[PDB]
Amino acid sequence: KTHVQLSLPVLQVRDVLVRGFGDSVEEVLSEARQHLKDGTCGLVEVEKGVLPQLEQPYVFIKRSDAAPHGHVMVELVAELEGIQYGRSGETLGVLVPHVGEIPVAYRKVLLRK
C-alpha cells in the first residue's frame, strides 16, 4: 500500500530518551520509515524551545492534504542546519524513536510510505 494508517504516541520532549534517528538526512529518513513500520516511532509537538532539545537532522511529519477515517495524510521532511529535504504542508510534529516513554496523546495519521 502507498499509505498506512498509524496511531503515533505523542511524547513530552523532556521524556524522550533517544532524541533523533541518526547522523545524516538520508539515515534519519530511513530510520524514521523503519520505526514507523515497526510501531516504534513517537511524535513530539513542536513549540518554542522543543527543537533545540532534540538532535539534528530532524524528521518532521507534515500535512500532505486538506483525513480518511480521522487520519491526517502526512509525509516526511528532514532538516539539517536550516535546509529541508522535501516540500510539504504544516508540521504536525518531529518524529523520534519510541522506547517505552508514556505518551500524553495519540496522533492518527495516514503516512505516504
PDB file of C-alpha atoms in Angstrom:
ATOM      1  CA  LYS A   1       0.000   0.000   0.000  1.00  0.00           C
ATOM      2  CA  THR A   2       1.210   3.568  -0.799  1.00  0.00           C
ATOM      3  CA  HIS A   3      -0.385   4.780   2.510  1.00  0.00           C
ATOM      4  CA  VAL A   4      -0.606   3.235   6.024  1.00  0.00           C
ATOM      5  CA  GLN A   5      -2.932   4.244   8.905  1.00  0.00           C
ATOM      6  CA  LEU A   6      -0.805   4.813  12.037  1.00  0.00           C
ATOM      7  CA  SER A   7      -1.558   5.979  15.601  1.00  0.00           C
ATOM      8  CA  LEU A   8       1.623   7.793  16.820  1.00  0.00           C
ATOM      9  CA  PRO A   9       2.228   8.155  20.593  1.00  0.00           C
ATOM     10  CA  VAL A  10       2.736  11.889  21.396  1.00  0.00           C
ATOM     11  CA  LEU A  11       5.688  12.256  23.822  1.00  0.00           C
ATOM     12  CA  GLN A  12       6.740  15.198  26.027  1.00  0.00           C
ATOM     13  CA  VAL A  13      10.196  16.407  24.791  1.00  0.00           C
ATOM     14  CA  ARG A  14      11.746  16.068  28.346  1.00  0.00           C
ATOM     15  CA  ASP A  15      10.678  12.338  28.464  1.00  0.00           C
ATOM     16  CA  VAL A  16      12.375  11.409  25.168  1.00  0.00           C
ATOM     17  CA  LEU A  17      15.333   9.050  25.762  1.00  0.00           C
ATOM     18  CA  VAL A  18      16.590   8.806  22.131  1.00  0.00           C
ATOM     19  CA  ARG A  19      16.403  12.334  20.702  1.00  0.00           C
ATOM     20  CA  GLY A  20      16.919  11.560  16.971  1.00  0.00           C
ATOM     21  CA  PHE A  21      17.234   8.827  14.336  1.00  0.00           C
ATOM     22  CA  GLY A  22      20.894   9.292  13.278  1.00  0.00           C
ATOM     23  CA  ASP A  23      23.577  11.456  11.758  1.00  0.00           C
ATOM     24  CA  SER A  24      22.610  12.164   8.071  1.00  0.00           C
ATOM     25  CA  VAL A  25      19.407  13.357   6.311  1.00  0.00           C
ATOM     26  CA  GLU A  26      19.342  10.007   4.443  1.00  0.00           C
ATOM     27  CA  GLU A  27      19.849   7.950   7.656  1.00  0.00           C
ATOM     28  CA  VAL A  28      17.195   9.777   9.727  1.00  0.00           C
ATOM     29  CA  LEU A  29      14.542   9.458   6.920  1.00  0.00           C
ATOM     30  CA  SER A  30      15.475   5.718   6.564  1.00  0.00           C
ATOM     31  CA  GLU A  31      15.321   5.065  10.349  1.00  0.00           C
ATOM     32  CA  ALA A  32      12.076   7.101  10.723  1.00  0.00           C
ATOM     33  CA  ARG A  33      10.391   4.948   7.994  1.00  0.00           C
ATOM     34  CA  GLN A  34      11.668   1.698   9.611  1.00  0.00           C
ATOM     35  CA  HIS A  35      10.384   2.770  13.127  1.00  0.00           C
ATOM     36  CA  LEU A  36       7.051   3.937  11.631  1.00  0.00           C
ATOM     37  CA  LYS A  37       6.677   0.454  10.006  1.00  0.00           C
ATOM     38  CA  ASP A  38       7.752  -1.380  13.290  1.00  0.00           C
ATOM     39  CA  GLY A  39       5.402   0.718  15.533  1.00  0.00           C
ATOM     40  CA  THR A  40       8.463   2.116  17.414  1.00  0.00           C
ATOM     41  CA  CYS A  41       8.060   5.815  16.396  1.00  0.00           C
ATOM     42  CA  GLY A  42       6.871   8.686  18.650  1.00  0.00           C
ATOM     43  CA  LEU A  43       5.850  12.251  17.821  1.00  0.00           C
ATOM     44  CA  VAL A  44       6.887  15.459  19.631  1.00  0.00           C
ATOM     45  CA  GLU A  45       4.659  18.510  19.033  1.00  0.00           C
ATOM     46  CA  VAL A  46       6.844  21.462  18.037  1.00  0.00           C
ATOM     47  CA  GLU A  47       6.686  24.577  20.268  1.00  0.00           C
ATOM     48  CA  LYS A  48       9.182  27.265  21.415  1.00  0.00           C
ATOM     49  CA  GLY A  49      12.260  25.510  22.873  1.00  0.00           C
ATOM     50  CA  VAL A  50      11.411  21.941  21.715  1.00  0.00           C
ATOM     51  CA  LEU A  51      13.699  21.585  18.652  1.00  0.00           C
ATOM     52  CA  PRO A  52      16.954  22.674  20.420  1.00  0.00           C
ATOM     53  CA  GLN A  53      16.270  19.805  22.953  1.00  0.00           C
ATOM     54  CA  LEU A  54      16.303  17.272  20.044  1.00  0.00           C
ATOM     55  CA  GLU A  55      19.163  16.081  17.804  1.00  0.00           C
ATOM     56  CA  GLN A  56      19.570  17.123  14.125  1.00  0.00           C
ATOM     57  CA  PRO A  57      18.967  16.018  11.494  1.00  0.00           C
ATOM     58  CA  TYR A  58      15.219  16.363  12.407  1.00  0.00           C
ATOM     59  CA  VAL A  59      12.447  14.324  10.760  1.00  0.00           C
ATOM     60  CA  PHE A  60       9.093  16.183  10.523  1.00  0.00           C
ATOM     61  CA  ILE A  61       5.665  14.811   9.654  1.00  0.00           C
ATOM     62  CA  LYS A  62       3.892  17.479   7.522  1.00  0.00           C
ATOM     63  CA  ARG A  63       0.249  17.620   6.275  1.00  0.00           C
ATOM     64  CA  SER A  64       0.247  16.423   2.597  1.00  0.00           C
ATOM     65  CA  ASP A  65      -3.549  17.088   2.006  1.00  0.00           C
ATOM     66  CA  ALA A  66      -6.663  19.055   3.367  1.00  0.00           C
ATOM     67  CA  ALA A  67      -8.374  12.969   6.533  1.00  0.00           C
ATOM     68  CA  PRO A  68      -9.563   9.399   5.777  1.00  0.00           C
ATOM     69  CA  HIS A  69     -11.159   7.699   8.865  1.00  0.00           C
ATOM     70  CA  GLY A  70      -9.815  10.575  11.127  1.00  0.00           C
ATOM     71  CA  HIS A  71      -6.193  10.027   9.849  1.00  0.00           C
ATOM     72  CA  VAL A  72      -4.477  13.253   8.570  1.00  0.00           C
ATOM     73  CA  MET A  73      -2.403  12.499   5.425  1.00  0.00           C
ATOM     74  CA  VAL A  74       1.290  13.258   6.131  1.00  0.00           C
ATOM     75  CA  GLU A  75       4.699  12.854   4.527  1.00  0.00           C
ATOM     76  CA  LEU A  76       8.281  13.001   5.893  1.00  0.00           C
ATOM     77  CA  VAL A  77      10.570  16.071   5.505  1.00  0.00           C
ATOM     78  CA  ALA A  78      14.101  16.121   7.072  1.00  0.00           C
ATOM     79  CA  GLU A  79      16.038  19.215   8.227  1.00  0.00           C
ATOM     80  CA  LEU A  80      19.793  19.805   8.875  1.00  0.00           C
ATOM     81  CA  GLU A  81      21.380  23.260   9.573  1.00  0.00           C
ATOM     82  CA  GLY A  82      18.186  25.025   8.350  1.00  0.00           C
ATOM     83  CA  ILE A  83      17.926  23.148   4.987  1.00  0.00           C
ATOM     84  CA  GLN A  84      14.863  20.863   4.436  1.00  0.00           C
ATOM     85  CA  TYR A  85      14.746  17.790   2.187  1.00  0.00           C
ATOM     86  CA  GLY A  86      11.230  17.641   0.872  1.00  0.00           C
ATOM     87  CA  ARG A  87       8.455  20.170   0.493  1.00  0.00           C
ATOM     88  CA  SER A  88       5.080  19.632   2.266  1.00  0.00           C
ATOM     89  CA  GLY A  89       2.386  21.350   4.397  1.00  0.00           C
ATOM     90  CA  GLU A  90       2.193  22.334   8.073  1.00  0.00           C
ATOM     91  CA  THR A  91       4.316  20.426  10.664  1.00  0.00           C
ATOM     92  CA  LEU A  92       2.278  18.038  12.918  1.00  0.00           C
ATOM     93  CA  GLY A  93       5.487  17.311  14.908  1.00  0.00           C
ATOM     94  CA  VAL A  94       9.039  15.889  14.936  1.00  0.00           C
ATOM     95  CA  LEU A  95       9.471  12.090  14.907  1.00  0.00           C
ATOM     96  CA  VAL A  96      11.705  10.324  17.434  1.00  0.00           C
ATOM     97  CA  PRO A  97      12.305   6.711  18.419  1.00  0.00           C
ATOM     98  CA  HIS A  98       9.797   5.400  20.973  1.00  0.00           C
ATOM     99  CA  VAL A  99      11.477   3.167  23.589  1.00  0.00           C
ATOM    100  CA  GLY A 100       8.539   2.918  26.101  1.00  0.00           C
ATOM    101  CA  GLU A 101       8.010   6.577  27.175  1.00  0.00           C
ATOM    102  CA  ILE A 102       4.394   7.158  28.398  1.00  0.00           C
ATOM    103  CA  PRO A 103       2.538   9.295  25.835  1.00  0.00           C
ATOM    104  CA  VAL A 104       0.167  12.238  26.559  1.00  0.00           C
ATOM    105  CA  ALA A 105      -1.978  11.547  23.437  1.00  0.00           C
ATOM    106  CA  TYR A 106      -2.101   9.740  20.060  1.00  0.00           C
ATOM    107  CA  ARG A 107      -2.000  11.455  16.627  1.00  0.00           C
ATOM    108  CA  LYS A 108      -3.848   9.402  13.925  1.00  0.00           C
ATOM    109  CA  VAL A 109      -2.019   9.903  10.586  1.00  0.00           C
ATOM    110  CA  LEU A 110      -2.155   8.360   7.088  1.00  0.00           C
ATOM    111  CA  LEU A 111       1.542   8.064   6.061  1.00  0.00           C
ATOM    112  CA  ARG A 112       2.617   8.232   2.389  1.00  0.00           C
ATOM    113  CA  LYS A 113       5.105   5.262   2.567  1.00  0.00           C
TER     114      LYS A 113
END
